[PDB]
């Protein structure tokens, strides 16, 4: 059982940075990817970015070259960079792992972001 702890959001002007950070617990040892997704309001929750455990990462067309996506092992913890936030940004941020079909996790709350401008 693994469960993941979300925090960094919030709202932001425009152009403004946030760093998101997903802290595990439980079974960590064996965590292969972990994503950051997002869901815009009204709309289906999306990923827009990962890592695997060996530190590969890849990201969704529209945060490339803005989001940075990276982990701590020694903290059990991935990390989501944003810069240059947009409003198109704003959503609930979360973070889990697909395993098959269905999540590594439960769903945590997420984080916010809100991005004004």
């Known amino acids: 059982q693994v469960q993941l702890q979300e925090s960094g959001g919030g709202l932001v002007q425009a152009g403004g940075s946030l760093r998101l950070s997903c802290a595990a617990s439980?079974?960590?040892?064996?965590?292969?990817?972990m994503g950051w997704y997002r869901q815009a309001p009204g709309k289906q929750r999306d990923l827009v970015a990962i890592?695997?455990?060996?530190?590969?990462?890849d990201y969704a067309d529209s945060v490339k070259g803005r989001f940075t996506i990276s982990r701590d092992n020694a903290k059990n913890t991935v990390y989501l960079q944003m810069d240059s936030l947009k409003p198109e940004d704003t959503a609930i941020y979360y973070c889990?792992?697909?395993?098959?079909?269905?999540?590594?996790?439960?769903w945590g709350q997420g984080t916010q972001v809100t991005v004004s401008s």
């Open positions: 889990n792992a697909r395993v098959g079909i269905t999540m590594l996790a439960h």
């Open positions: 439980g079974s960590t040892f064996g965590i292969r990817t």
């Open positions: 890592i695997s455990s060996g530190g590969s990462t």
